[PDB]
CSV table of all heavy atoms in Angstrom, one decimal:
chain,number,residue,atom,x,y,z
R,77,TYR,N,18.9,31.1,29.1
R,77,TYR,CA,18.1,30.1,29.6
R,77,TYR,C,18.0,28.9,28.6
R,77,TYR,O,17.8,29.1,27.4
R,77,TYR,CB,16.7,30.6,29.8
R,77,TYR,CG,16.6,31.8,30.8
R,77,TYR,CD1,17.0,33.1,30.3
R,77,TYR,CD2,16.3,31.6,32.1
R,77,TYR,CE1,17.0,34.2,31.2
R,77,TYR,CE2,16.3,32.7,33.0
R,77,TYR,CZ,16.7,34.0,32.5
R,77,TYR,OH,16.6,35.0,33.4
R,78,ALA,N,18.1,27.7,29.2
R,78,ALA,CA,18.0,26.5,28.4
R,78,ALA,C,16.9,25.6,29.0
R,78,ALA,O,16.6,25.7,30.2
R,78,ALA,CB,19.3,25.8,28.4
R,79,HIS,N,16.3,24.7,28.2
R,79,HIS,CA,15.2,23.8,28.5
R,79,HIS,C,15.7,22.4,28.5
R,79,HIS,O,16.3,22.0,27.5
R,79,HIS,CB,14.1,24.0,27.6
R,79,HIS,CG,12.8,23.3,28.0
R,79,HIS,ND1,12.6,22.0,27.6
R,79,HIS,CD2,11.8,23.7,28.7
R,79,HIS,CE1,11.4,21.7,28.1
R,79,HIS,NE2,10.9,22.7,28.7
R,80,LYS,N,15.6,21.7,29.6
R,80,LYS,CA,16.1,20.3,29.7
R,80,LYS,C,15.2,19.6,30.7
R,80,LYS,O,14.9,20.2,31.7
R,80,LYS,CB,17.6,20.3,30.1
R,80,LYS,CG,18.6,20.1,29.0
R,80,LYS,CD,19.9,19.7,29.6
R,80,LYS,CE,20.6,18.5,28.8
R,80,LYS,NZ,21.4,17.7,29.7
R,81,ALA,N,14.9,18.4,30.5
R,81,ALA,CA,14.1,17.6,31.5
R,81,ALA,C,12.8,18.4,31.9
R,81,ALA,O,12.4,18.4,33.0
R,81,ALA,CB,15.0,17.5,32.8
R,82,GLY,N,12.1,18.9,30.8
R,82,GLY,CA,10.8,19.6,31.0
R,82,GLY,C,10.8,20.9,31.7
R,82,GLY,O,9.7,21.4,32.1
R,83,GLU,N,12.0,21.5,32.0
R,83,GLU,CA,12.0,22.7,32.8
R,83,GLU,C,13.0,23.7,32.1
R,83,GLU,O,14.0,23.3,31.6
R,83,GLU,CB,12.5,22.4,34.2
R,83,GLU,CG,11.7,21.4,35.0
R,83,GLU,CD,10.3,21.9,35.4
R,83,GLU,OE1,10.1,23.1,35.4
R,83,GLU,OE2,9.4,21.1,35.6
R,84,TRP,N,12.7,25.0,32.3
R,84,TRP,CA,13.7,26.1,32.0
R,84,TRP,C,14.6,26.3,33.1
R,84,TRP,O,14.1,26.3,34.3
R,84,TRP,CB,13.0,27.4,31.6
R,84,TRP,CG,12.2,27.3,30.3
R,84,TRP,CD1,10.9,27.0,30.1
R,84,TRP,CD2,12.8,27.4,29.0
R,84,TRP,NE1,10.6,27.0,28.8
R,84,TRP,CE2,11.8,27.2,28.1
R,84,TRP,CE3,14.1,27.6,28.6
R,84,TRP,CZ2,12.0,27.2,26.7
R,84,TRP,CZ3,14.3,27.6,27.2
R,84,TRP,CH2,13.3,27.4,26.3
R,85,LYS,N,15.9,26.5,32.8
R,85,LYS,CA,16.8,27.0,33.8
R,85,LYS,C,17.7,28.1,33.4
R,85,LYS,O,18.1,28.1,32.2
R,85,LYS,CB,17.7,25.8,34.3
R,85,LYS,CG,17.0,24.8,35.2
R,85,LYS,CD,18.0,24.0,36.0
R,85,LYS,CE,19.3,23.5,35.2
R,85,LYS,NZ,20.4,24.5,35.1
R,86,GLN,N,18.0,29.0,34.3
R,86,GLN,CA,18.9,30.1,34.0
R,86,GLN,C,20.3,29.5,34.1
R,86,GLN,O,20.8,29.0,35.1
R,86,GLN,CB,18.8,31.2,35.0
R,86,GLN,CG,19.7,32.4,34.8
R,86,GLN,CD,19.7,33.4,36.0
R,86,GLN,OE1,18.8,34.3,36.0
R,86,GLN,NE2,20.6,33.2,36.9
R,87,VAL,N,21.1,29.6,32.9
R,87,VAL,CA,22.4,29.1,32.8
R,87,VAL,C,23.5,30.2,33.2
R,87,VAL,O,24.4,29.9,33.9
R,87,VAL,CB,22.7,28.7,31.4
R,87,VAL,CG1,24.1,28.2,31.2
R,87,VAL,CG2,21.8,27.5,31.0
R,88,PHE,N,23.3,31.4,32.8
R,88,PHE,CA,24.0,32.6,33.3
R,88,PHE,C,23.2,33.9,33.3
R,88,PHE,O,22.2,33.9,32.6
R,88,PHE,CB,25.4,32.7,32.5
R,88,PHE,CG,25.2,33.1,31.1
R,88,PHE,CD1,24.9,34.4,30.7
R,88,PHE,CD2,25.6,32.2,30.1
R,88,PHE,CE1,24.8,34.7,29.4
R,88,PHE,CE2,25.6,32.6,28.7
R,88,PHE,CZ,25.2,33.9,28.4
R,89,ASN,N,23.7,34.8,34.1
R,89,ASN,CA,23.0,36.1,34.2
R,89,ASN,C,24.0,37.1,34.7
R,89,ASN,O,24.4,37.1,35.9
R,89,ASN,CB,21.8,36.0,35.2
R,89,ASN,CG,21.1,37.3,35.4
R,89,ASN,OD1,21.6,38.4,35.1
R,89,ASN,ND2,19.8,37.2,35.9
R,90,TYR,N,24.5,38.0,33.8
R,90,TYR,CA,25.6,39.0,34.1
R,90,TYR,C,24.9,40.2,34.7
R,90,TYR,O,24.7,41.2,34.1
R,90,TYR,CB,26.4,39.3,32.9
R,90,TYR,CG,27.4,38.2,32.5
R,90,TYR,CD1,27.0,37.2,31.7
R,90,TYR,CD2,28.7,38.2,33.0
R,90,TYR,CE1,27.8,36.1,31.4
R,90,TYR,CE2,29.5,37.2,32.6
R,90,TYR,CZ,29.1,36.2,31.9
R,90,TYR,OH,30.0,35.1,31.5
R,91,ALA,N,24.4,40.0,36.0
R,91,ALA,CA,23.7,41.1,36.6
R,91,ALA,C,24.4,42.4,36.8
R,91,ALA,O,25.7,42.4,36.9
R,91,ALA,CB,23.1,40.6,38.0
Side-chain angles (χ1 to χ4, degrees):
Chain R
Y77 301 80
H79 189 273
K80 257 200 139 211
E83 303 292 339
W84 292 98
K85 287 202 314 87
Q86 181 188 274
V87 175
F88 68 73
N89 181 340
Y90 286 85

